[PDB]
Write a protein that binds this DNA or RNA. Sequence first.
RNA 1: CGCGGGGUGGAGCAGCCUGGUAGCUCGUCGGGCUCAUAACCCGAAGGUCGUCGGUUCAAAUCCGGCCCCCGCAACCA
RNA 2: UCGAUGUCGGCUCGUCGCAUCCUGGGGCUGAAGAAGGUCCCAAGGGUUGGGCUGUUCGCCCAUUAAAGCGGCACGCGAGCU
RNA 3: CGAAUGCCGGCAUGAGUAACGAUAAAGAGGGUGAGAAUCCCUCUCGCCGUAAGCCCAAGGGUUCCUACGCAAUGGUCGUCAGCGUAGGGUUAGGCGGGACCUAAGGUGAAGCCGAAAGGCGUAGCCGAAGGGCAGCCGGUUAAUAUUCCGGCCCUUCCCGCAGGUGCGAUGGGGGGACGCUCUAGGCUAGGGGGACCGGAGCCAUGGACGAGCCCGGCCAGAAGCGCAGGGUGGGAGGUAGGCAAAUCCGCCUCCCAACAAGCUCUGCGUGGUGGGGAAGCCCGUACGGGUGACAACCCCCCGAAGCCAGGGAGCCAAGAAAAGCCUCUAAGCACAACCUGCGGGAACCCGUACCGCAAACCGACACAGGUGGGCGGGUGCAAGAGCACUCAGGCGCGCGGGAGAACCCUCGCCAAGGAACUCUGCAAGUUGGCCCCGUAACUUCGGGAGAAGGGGUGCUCCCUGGGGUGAUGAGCCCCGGGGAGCCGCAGUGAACAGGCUCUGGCGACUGUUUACCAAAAACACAGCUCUCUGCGAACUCGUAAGAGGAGGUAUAGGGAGCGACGCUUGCCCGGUGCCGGAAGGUCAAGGGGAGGGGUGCAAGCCCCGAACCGAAGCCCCGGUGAACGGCGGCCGUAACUAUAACGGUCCUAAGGUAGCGAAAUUCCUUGUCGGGUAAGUUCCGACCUGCACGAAAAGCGUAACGACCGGAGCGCUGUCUCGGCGAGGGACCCGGUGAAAUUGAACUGGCCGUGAAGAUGCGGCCUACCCGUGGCAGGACGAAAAGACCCCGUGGAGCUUUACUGCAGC
RNA 4: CGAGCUAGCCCUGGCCAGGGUGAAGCUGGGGUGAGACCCAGUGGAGGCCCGAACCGGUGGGGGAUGCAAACCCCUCGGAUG
RNA 5: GUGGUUCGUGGAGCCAUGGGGGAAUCUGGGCGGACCACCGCCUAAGGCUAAGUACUCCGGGUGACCGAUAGCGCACCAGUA
RNA 6: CCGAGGGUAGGGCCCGUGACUGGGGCGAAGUCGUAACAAGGUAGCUGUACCGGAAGGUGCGGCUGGA
RNA 7: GUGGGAGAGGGUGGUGGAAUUCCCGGAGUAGCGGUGAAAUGCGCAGAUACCGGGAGGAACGCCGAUGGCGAAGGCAGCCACCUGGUCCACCCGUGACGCUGAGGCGCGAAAGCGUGGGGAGCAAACCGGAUUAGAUACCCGGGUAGUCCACGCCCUAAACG
Lengths: 49, 272
Amino acid sequence: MKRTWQPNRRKRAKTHGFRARMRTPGGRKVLKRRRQKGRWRLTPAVRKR
Amino acid sequence: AVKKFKPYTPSRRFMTVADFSEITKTEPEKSLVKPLKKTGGRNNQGRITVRFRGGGHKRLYRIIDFKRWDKVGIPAKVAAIEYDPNRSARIALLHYVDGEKRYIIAPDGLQVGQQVVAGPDAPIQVGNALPLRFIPVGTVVHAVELEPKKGAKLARAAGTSAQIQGREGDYVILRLPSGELRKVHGECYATVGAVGNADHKNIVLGKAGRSRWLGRRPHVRGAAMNPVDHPHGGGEGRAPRGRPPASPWGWQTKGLKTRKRRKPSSRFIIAR
RNA sequence: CGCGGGGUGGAGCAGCCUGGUAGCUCGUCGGGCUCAUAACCCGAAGGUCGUCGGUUCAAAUCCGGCCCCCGCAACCA
RNA sequence: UCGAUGUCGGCUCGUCGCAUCCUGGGGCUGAAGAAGGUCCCAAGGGUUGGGCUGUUCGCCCAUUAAAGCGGCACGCGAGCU
RNA sequence: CGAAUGCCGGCAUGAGUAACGAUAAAGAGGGUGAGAAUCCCUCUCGCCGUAAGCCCAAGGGUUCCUACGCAAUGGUCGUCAGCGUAGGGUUAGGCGGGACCUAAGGUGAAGCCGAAAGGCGUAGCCGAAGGGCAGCCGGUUAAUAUUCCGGCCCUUCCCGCAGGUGCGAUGGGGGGACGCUCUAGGCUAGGGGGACCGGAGCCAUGGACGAGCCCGGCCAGAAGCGCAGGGUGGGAGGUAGGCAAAUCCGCCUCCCAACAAGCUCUGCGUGGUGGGGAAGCCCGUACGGGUGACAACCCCCCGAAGCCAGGGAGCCAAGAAAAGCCUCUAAGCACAACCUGCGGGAACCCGUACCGCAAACCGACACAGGUGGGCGGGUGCAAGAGCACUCAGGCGCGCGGGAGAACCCUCGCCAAGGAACUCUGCAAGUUGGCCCCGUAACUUCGGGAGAAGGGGUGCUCCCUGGGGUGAUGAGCCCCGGGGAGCCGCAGUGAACAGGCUCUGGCGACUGUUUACCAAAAACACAGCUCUCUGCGAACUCGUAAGAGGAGGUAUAGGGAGCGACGCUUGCCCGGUGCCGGAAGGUCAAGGGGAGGGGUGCAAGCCCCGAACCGAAGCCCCGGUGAACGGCGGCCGUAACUAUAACGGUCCUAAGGUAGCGAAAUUCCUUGUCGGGUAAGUUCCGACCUGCACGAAAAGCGUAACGACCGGAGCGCUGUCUCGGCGAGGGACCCGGUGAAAUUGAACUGGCCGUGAAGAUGCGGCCUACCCGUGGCAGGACGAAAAGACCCCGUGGAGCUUUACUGCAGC
RNA sequence: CGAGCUAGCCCUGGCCAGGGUGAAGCUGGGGUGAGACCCAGUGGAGGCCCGAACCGGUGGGGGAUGCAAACCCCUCGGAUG
RNA sequence: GUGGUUCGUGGAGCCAUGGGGGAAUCUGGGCGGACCACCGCCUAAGGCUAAGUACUCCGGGUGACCGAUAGCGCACCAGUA
RNA sequence: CCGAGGGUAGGGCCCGUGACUGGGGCGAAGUCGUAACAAGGUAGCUGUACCGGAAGGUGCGGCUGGA
RNA sequence: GUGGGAGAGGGUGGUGGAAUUCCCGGAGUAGCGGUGAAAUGCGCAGAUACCGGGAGGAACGCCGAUGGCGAAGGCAGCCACCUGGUCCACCCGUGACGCUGAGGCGCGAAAGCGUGGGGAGCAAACCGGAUUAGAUACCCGGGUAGUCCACGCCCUAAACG
Ligand SMILES: NC[C@@H]1O[C@H](O[C@H]2[C@@H](O)[C@H](O[C@@H]3[C@@H](O)[C@H](N)C[C@H](N)[C@H]3O[C@H]3O[C@H](CO)[C@@H](O)[C@H](O)[C@H]3N)O[C@@H]2CO)[C@H](N)[C@@H](O)[C@@H]1O
Ligand SMILES: [Mg+2]
Ligand SMILES: [Mg+2]
Ligand SMILES: [Mg+2]
Ligand SMILES: [Mg+2]
Ligand SMILES: [Mg+2]
Ligand SMILES: [Mg+2]
Ligand SMILES: [Mg+2]
Ligand SMILES: [Mg+2]
Ligand SMILES: [Mg+2]
Ligand SMILES: [Mg+2]
Ligand SMILES: [Mg+2]
Ligand SMILES: [Mg+2]
Ligand SMILES: [Mg+2]
Ligand SMILES: [Mg+2]
Ligand SMILES: [Mg+2]
Ligand SMILES: [Mg+2]
Ligand SMILES: [Mg+2]
Ligand SMILES: [Mg+2]
Ligand SMILES: [Mg+2]
Ligand SMILES: [Mg+2]
Ligand SMILES: [Mg+2]
Ligand SMILES: [Mg+2]
Ligand SMILES: [Mg+2]
Ligand SMILES: [Mg+2]
Ligand SMILES: [Mg+2]
Ligand SMILES: [Mg+2]
Ligand SMILES: [Mg+2]
Ligand SMILES: [Mg+2]
Ligand SMILES: [Mg+2]
Ligand SMILES: [Mg+2]
Ligand SMILES: [Mg+2]
Ligand SMILES: [Mg+2]
Ligand SMILES: [Mg+2]
Ligand SMILES: [Mg+2]
Ligand SMILES: [Mg+2]
Ligand SMILES: [Mg+2]
Ligand SMILES: [Mg+2]
Ligand SMILES: [Mg+2]
Ligand SMILES: [Mg+2]
Ligand SMILES: [Mg+2]
Ligand SMILES: [Mg+2]
Ligand SMILES: [Mg+2]
Ligand SMILES: [Mg+2]
Ligand SMILES: [Mg+2]
Ligand SMILES: [Mg+2]
Ligand SMILES: [Mg+2]
Ligand SMILES: [Mg+2]
Ligand SMILES: [Mg+2]
Ligand SMILES: [Mg+2]
Ligand SMILES: [Mg+2]
Ligand SMILES: [Mg+2]
Ligand SMILES: [Mg+2]
Ligand SMILES: [Mg+2]
Ligand SMILES: [Mg+2]
Ligand SMILES: [Mg+2]
Ligand SMILES: [Mg+2]
Ligand SMILES: [Mg+2]
Ligand SMILES: [Mg+2]
Ligand SMILES: [Mg+2]
Ligand SMILES: [Mg+2]
Ligand SMILES: [Mg+2]
Ligand SMILES: [Mg+2]
Ligand SMILES: [Mg+2]
Ligand SMILES: [Mg+2]
Ligand SMILES: [Mg+2]
Ligand SMILES: [Mg+2]
Ligand SMILES: [Mg+2]
Ligand SMILES: [Mg+2]
Ligand SMILES: [Mg+2]
Ligand SMILES: [Mg+2]
Ligand SMILES: [Mg+2]
Ligand SMILES: [Mg+2]
Ligand SMILES: [Mg+2]
Ligand SMILES: [Mg+2]
Ligand SMILES: [Mg+2]
Ligand SMILES: [Mg+2]
Ligand SMILES: [Mg+2]
Ligand SMILES: [Mg+2]
Ligand SMILES: [Mg+2]
Ligand SMILES: [Mg+2]
Ligand SMILES: [Mg+2]
Ligand SMILES: [Mg+2]
Ligand SMILES: [Mg+2]
Ligand SMILES: [Mg+2]
Ligand SMILES: [Mg+2]
Ligand SMILES: [Mg+2]
Ligand SMILES: [Mg+2]
Ligand SMILES: [Mg+2]
Ligand SMILES: [Mg+2]
Ligand SMILES: [Mg+2]
Ligand SMILES: [Mg+2]
Ligand SMILES: [Mg+2]
Ligand SMILES: [Mg+2]
Ligand SMILES: [Mg+2]
Ligand SMILES: [Mg+2]
Ligand SMILES: [Mg+2]
Ligand SMILES: [Mg+2]
Ligand SMILES: [Mg+2]
Ligand SMILES: [Mg+2]
Ligand SMILES: [Mg+2]
Ligand SMILES: [Mg+2]
Ligand SMILES: [Mg+2]
Ligand SMILES: [Mg+2]
Ligand SMILES: [Mg+2]
Ligand SMILES: [Mg+2]
Ligand SMILES: [Mg+2]
Ligand SMILES: [Mg+2]
Ligand SMILES: [Mg+2]
Ligand SMILES: [Mg+2]
Ligand SMILES: [Mg+2]
Ligand SMILES: [Mg+2]
Ligand SMILES: [Mg+2]
Ligand SMILES: [Mg+2]
Ligand SMILES: [Mg+2]
Ligand SMILES: [Mg+2]
Ligand SMILES: [Mg+2]
Ligand SMILES: [Mg+2]
Ligand SMILES: [Mg+2]
Ligand SMILES: [Mg+2]
Ligand SMILES: [Mg+2]
Ligand SMILES: [Mg+2]
Ligand SMILES: [Mg+2]
Ligand SMILES: [Mg+2]
Ligand SMILES: [Mg+2]
Ligand SMILES: [Mg+2]
Ligand SMILES: [Mg+2]
Ligand SMILES: [Mg+2]
Ligand SMILES: [Mg+2]
Ligand SMILES: [Mg+2]
Ligand SMILES: [Mg+2]
Ligand SMILES: [Mg+2]
Ligand SMILES: [Mg+2]
Ligand SMILES: [Mg+2]
Ligand SMILES: [Mg+2]
């Protein structure tokens, strides 16, 4: 059947990107938490040009 | 007149379509004056706030003239009468000698080629606009302003009118389509005649689809729902209500008057 | 089986809960009116209060046990 | 037996008890014969096909030597429905 | 530490067990190799072929090409690989994206709002498979190419020279610019045919040296033409509108046009040049190379859904924006500038490999699932993207080999009987395409209808009739009709392709829903009715601002119910709701102080505090049922009995009318007649004693409609009597890889007892050499899930209201 | 933190072979005082019919440590809304 | 009308205060738990102000702290796979 | 080829029959009430419409076969 | 044909006042209504009665008749338009064109039906109050369809002279 993962680079970027997270206090805290944690990747890596 | 069909299909046996014979050879509209992009959307910034809206034909807005006092004294020739997707009435395309082209909402009896004009001057004829004062008591009228210089707001639906009843210092009394008795300021413009397309009420949609074409989504009964959804939801195999009939939001829907009492508008109203 | 409602002249109903007196209606009987009958009028009688028992100074009336009458319930399986 | 014993009826397969429906053996009979009634021995084998109902049962249809009762977790769902 | 269905780990059992992922299928010879069913090569075979073939987009991201490799990954093997090591490989002014535009939406200076964080928010900005925009055809690489190279062709920009003109904008206007369905003409794509032109070869096995078989007979292309079509009127005056201005546009007014004549713009045809070019055969490659060839490269036909495109015609639901483009002027500039022609010079950034219906994307897997767009050849079946076969192209689905038991899946066939099977004809059968006869009740006059039931269907020869395209003829192509005749069991000879009726229920109907057990009679629906709302509407979301409603205005918008259509919807307003009542009763804060207390020496200061004044709500008075709801008991009575039109009485707010009625409703019940049957708890018609119908939670009907539910009959069958044979895939045996839940340990028999009451394990007796293998499924209260019912717990949640208590709201 | 599954709405694009039946409306004829209306012919309507793609998920069987945490075979509904 | 305080409307002050009314400048004002007298204490409606105190990313010392199933999640290129 | 007739299939008229049901005819002395004939104690009749155990009543218009 | 006349003859548009009902204002107090008599009912929440104002619907008093017109059903305030029939004078033109009329076709009171509109009075149904033995009636107080209009149906009558 159709599963739940339907990859889209634009969506992944607009949805979970560094700039989206930065836009709101909710998201800014996510970066803070991930930084303090020592996460190698703050936001998902969306590729291609 | 109303177009009628033979039952060559079920739902074609009741279906019924407007007569478009008053639609003069001018079916597609007029750029310049109108159209605008019209912005379909069944809801506010976010959430739906009027249920069951959506779908249905794309539209172009015809930006019509609801304040006729710009062109006081300037007459215009009625050039055409065309279909307007965004109202029950039809609209008149008129050419002002000025050059300017406006649409007026098209009254019953309006003929193409006719002369029409607005102002204190203005022969009392179908199509003309006047401040309510100079209009003879008892004449039927439409596109009436509520307060002066604020635009036509009463009687624009197809086949509607108001009748002038009497006067009272600065106000003339109106009898509105609903039957209400209203004091409306003398200085309010209103155009003589009834609205026309009066056979609008006689049309039978005929099937579900037609409803959808006009963007009317299926309306579901409270009875059909559940207690979470509606006061009428549940219980077992059908149910008669079990309380005084209500809206989904709990207010009673048979009888409960809802106009706020202390409206300052009150001292200008005399009926139902 | 459990639940609670009734048994009052010939018929249908009051009366009880706040015991002490059984009343209304109809029908029955005698008298009248009419040529006559019905209607009307004037008068008149008729109830061991379902049946056993005590409760009491006294039970239609309060309390128990049976007697038929009516209405309710009888559910998860 | 609730850290589960699947619960009606049908179906397949059975198998047992006899307080025996049929067939064998009998006694009494208000047993002439034939046919019954009834009781006593006896389970070795038998114990049909349908209409209606989920039905068990039952009621009919047409036959029969007869159209037996009951147990086996209202036998049988790691066999079916 | 021994138990916590404990935690983490390791290793056992089941077990050499089930499996090895589509039943599209394989065999052999030769190579390589330490080692081959599996790797390369060849021959033969089978499978896709509106794909299982090629081209995009998304997503993936080294998976591409090559050398050397086989420990692992591959469901076996592997010399192979999408795997391991290394190296190479993606070339653009013209394709796509960006230095262009705007959509919903986002963002957002002005502005408004919010305890904060933040929420709105016109102008502008951002935002794309939408608008705008200049590249076609061939060649070379192991791997890239509309990117390189070849030929032919364009686009901007910047500086020049040459000629024209009032040039000039983010501002005006015009255009871009828009639906659906049906379409005409002329073409192109693609396809068929050819005695003609080009070709290696070919006569097989009885015949054919022949218009014989086989292969192939194009591609691109500026100008100028040619054909088809798209667009457009030209003058002059007046001008108060397009938010400054206008020579523009708009509105009047006259003349000329009414035509595509003329202007331009597309597409196609031709085009200077350029390019490709088969089968076969010989080569050594994994693959591509030469030869055929100096290839030929020509006529006929069919022909689009594609091109001309902003084409036309009808309809109602009435069909984006902005820029590029044309123009009009404004400031300003007019030694500037802009247009046209020519020259030279400038033209950046990112993507470009490969997979791409799948072994590289989404599903933990090399997964039988999912995944948008374009091409998708031929022949035959009426047609088509259907179906059968087959081009090109691509596969034989990464375990094999044997055997030929039960039993299972998938299939085929059956005497006689045809529903007896069964909860049901569940399933399976029959039927099946086209043409032609031929068709009922009913009906809203459409339909019912493919009603039913029928016949025709091939091939041969003769005669004969319309078109199409060609000239009016030839052919090639599409449709017809008539007449003889041949053959078979059988002619849509294979494949795709209704079983038909009758009568009830429910719902009108197409529609919609429980993604992953219910598709319905539930939802919706047109339509009907009630009720709210006069517009800063009611209603909804948000504290707000604000937005929806709606850029709507009572023929409009919200809420409820009912649900096409026909005939209809009775009576009760006592209770509850809703509505309407300047009276009255009651009523909080506050107004009011008659009056009483606390202090003080007093002036004072501080409390209590009754009259009466005080809203809405209630109470009370009214109305209202397509508002919540409701719509009776008993006793008698007719000249056969029976029965009760008739009466008496109690009670009510009023006591169910019509129309249905043992029902989707009927307990007693298989009610009672009647029909269908040999037989009928079901079905159909009736009676009515309606446990417990009933009129908009609508009542009684209704043609048509339905994967809805019930009953009946015909037709037909393996459903059955009642089985039997046959096929393929497994099962079984050999080689290879090889799991699982489960498991206190086990050396694990019957009966009769007994035991916590159903024993392999206790008692007595009975039987029983040790161990396996294919099978059946009675038992181990077998496995699986801390029972889903039940009850408990002062455990939890969703729900309702005249439970309490608050809160938003009014 | 989630509408990359799903539920609706908005904006922009796309897809729906091939047949059937043949409404209005025109056109001619008939009819009439003018009509209505009736005939053909044309016309090409429709939550219309058959049937692919495509969107479904009706009935049965299979599958059930599956190929699959919804699948496969036969069968069925819609397919210009 | 509320918060703060041991204070939950209590006899409820004091300190903060959203709403209404609304003074004085020392013979002025507040408080000393309703209030009033008396006796006392402070001087509101402007601000600033070390130190003693809290913490422990980071460096150092020390442990009747662990010693690779412990000790931080990580002794190991871990907020990695 | 035709063709008596036989078979399958579907329609047309007619007759018989049917639980049950509708109203109808006739049947000496059954119940109910009084509609009509006298102005019939509400003038009557009437088409239509609703309602009622029943004659009947009533609404609207009409008639004189009444005042 | 020529020239005249009477008419509630038909259709559409427009319009006048009287009266009833309701709302509003004034003034006004204890009953009004109704009948054979009563009661339901209306009214101190201010009725009836009177004044003034507004709204709306239907019907046109006097003239009016024993009258006029129409083929019938029918048709009545007033105005205009559109329009049918008809009588009279003259004897002007035609020149038998004549009468009836199966079917067909139109017309057709009232009540009723459809969709829309309107609704003042009245008024089937219905509810009450009296009268009755009962009264689903007569009388009384309410009241819905309807009566009114546009259009479409219906087609019957004591459509009677
Ligand atoms: N022939 C009379 C027709 O039927 C009806 O009349 C019938 C009934 O009304 C009538 O019934 C009458 C009754 O009215 C009257 N008051 C009492 C009488 N005993 C009855 O009588 C009836 O029954 C008896 C006995 O059985 C018979 O002998 C007698 O013939 C018969 N008429 O009997 C008639 C049938 O015979 C209509 N009313 C009348 O208009 C119609 O024309
Ligand atoms: Mg525009
Ligand atoms: Mg947002
Ligand atoms: Mg609904
Ligand atoms: Mg529900
Ligand atoms: Mg709720
Ligand atoms: Mg609720
Ligand atoms: Mg129910
Ligand atoms: Mg409810
Ligand atoms: Mg339960
Ligand atoms: Mg248990
Ligand atoms: Mg256990
Ligand atoms: Mg024995
Ligand atoms: Mg014997
Ligand atoms: Mg047995
Ligand atoms: Mg049993
Ligand atoms: Mg038992
Ligand atoms: Mg059992
Ligand atoms: Mg089972
Ligand atoms: Mg222990
Ligand atoms: Mg352990
Ligand atoms: Mg373990
Ligand atoms: Mg095993
Ligand atoms: Mg085995
Ligand atoms: Mg195996
Ligand atoms: Mg395999
Ligand atoms: Mg090797
Ligand atoms: Mg094939
Ligand atoms: Mg790699
Ligand atoms: Mg490779
Ligand atoms: Mg190699
Ligand atoms: Mg391997
Ligand atoms: Mg694998
Ligand atoms: Mg590699
Ligand atoms: Mg740049
Ligand atoms: Mg940009
Ligand atoms: Mg932009
Ligand atoms: Mg925008
Ligand atoms: Mg924002
Ligand atoms: Mg673009
Ligand atoms: Mg480009
Ligand atoms: Mg490649
Ligand atoms: Mg210029
Ligand atoms: Mg511009
Ligand atoms: Mg512009
Ligand atoms: Mg030979
Ligand atoms: Mg060319
Ligand atoms: Mg200007
Ligand atoms: Mg070559
Ligand atoms: Mg077009
Ligand atoms: Mg712009
Ligand atoms: Mg490339
Ligand atoms: Mg590529
Ligand atoms: Mg594809
Ligand atoms: Mg594989
Ligand atoms: Mg796959
Ligand atoms: Mg797909
Ligand atoms: Mg075909
Ligand atoms: Mg094709
Ligand atoms: Mg195919
Ligand atoms: Mg057989
Ligand atoms: Mg046979
Ligand atoms: Mg048969
Ligand atoms: Mg049977
Ligand atoms: Mg059986
Ligand atoms: Mg059946
Ligand atoms: Mg079947
Ligand atoms: Mg059926
Ligand atoms: Mg049916
Ligand atoms: Mg349905
Ligand atoms: Mg679905
Ligand atoms: Mg489901
Ligand atoms: Mg379905
Ligand atoms: Mg909101
Ligand atoms: Mg708004
Ligand atoms: Mg809006
Ligand atoms: Mg509405
Ligand atoms: Mg409903
Ligand atoms: Mg319903
Ligand atoms: Mg219904
Ligand atoms: Mg009702
Ligand atoms: Mg009530
Ligand atoms: Mg009430
Ligand atoms: Mg009331
Ligand atoms: Mg009230
Ligand atoms: Mg009050
Ligand atoms: Mg019954
Ligand atoms: Mg019932
Ligand atoms: Mg049968
Ligand atoms: Mg029977
Ligand atoms: Mg029977
Ligand atoms: Mg019901
Ligand atoms: Mg109801
Ligand atoms: Mg359906
Ligand atoms: Mg079989
Ligand atoms: Mg086999
Ligand atoms: Mg093996
Ligand atoms: Mg042993
Ligand atoms: Mg035992
Ligand atoms: Mg032992
Ligand atoms: Mg033992
Ligand atoms: Mg077992
Ligand atoms: Mg078991
Ligand atoms: Mg178990
Ligand atoms: Mg438990
Ligand atoms: Mg408790
Ligand atoms: Mg036609
Ligand atoms: Mg069509
Ligand atoms: Mg369709
Ligand atoms: Mg299902
Ligand atoms: Mg279909
Ligand atoms: Mg406090
Ligand atoms: Mg103080
Ligand atoms: Mg102090
Ligand atoms: Mg102090
Ligand atoms: Mg400080
Ligand atoms: Mg560790
Ligand atoms: Mg260690
Ligand atoms: Mg008959
Ligand atoms: Mg009879
Ligand atoms: Mg009478
Ligand atoms: Mg009488
Ligand atoms: Mg009388
Ligand atoms: Mg009458
Ligand atoms: Mg009456
Ligand atoms: Mg003469
Ligand atoms: Mg003469
Ligand atoms: Mg005549
Ligand atoms: Mg009438
Ligand atoms: Mg209607
Ligand atoms: Mg009245
Ligand atoms: Mg009397
Ligand atoms: Mg009355
Ligand atoms: Mg009539
Ligand atoms: Mg007369």
